[PDB]
Amino acid sequence: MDIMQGPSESFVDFANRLIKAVEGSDLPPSARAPVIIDCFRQKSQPDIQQLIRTAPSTLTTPGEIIKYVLDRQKTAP
């Protein structure tokens, strides 16, 4: 309900509220991921949601999104 990413909130910040929020629910293990998956695309900021929204590759899991988030956040010069 009140799970919304902040203006300048880090990724690990939101996902913790999400994951913890999801774990706290009656959602099954196999369905926990799919929940966070859609949750991001609808609760994440425009900066992240935009990437996930039209992001290629089979991004159907958390293990891929975070990898994808950091993979895109690879601002290492």
User: Where exactly are the structural domains of the chain?
Assistant: 1-77
Pair of tokens at residue 27: 């959602």
Cα R_g (the chain), whole angstroms: 12
**Pure H helices in the chain:** 11-23, 29-43, 46-54, 62-72
Looking at the structure, give the CATH architecture of the domain made up of residues 1-77. Answer: Orthogonal Bundle (1.10)
Structure-determination approach: NMR
Residue the block writes with tokens 């996902």 = 15
Question: For residue 60, which phi and psi values (nearest 5 degrees)?
Answer: -120, 15
Q: Which of 55, 31, 38, 43 is nearest to 2 (CA)?
A: 43
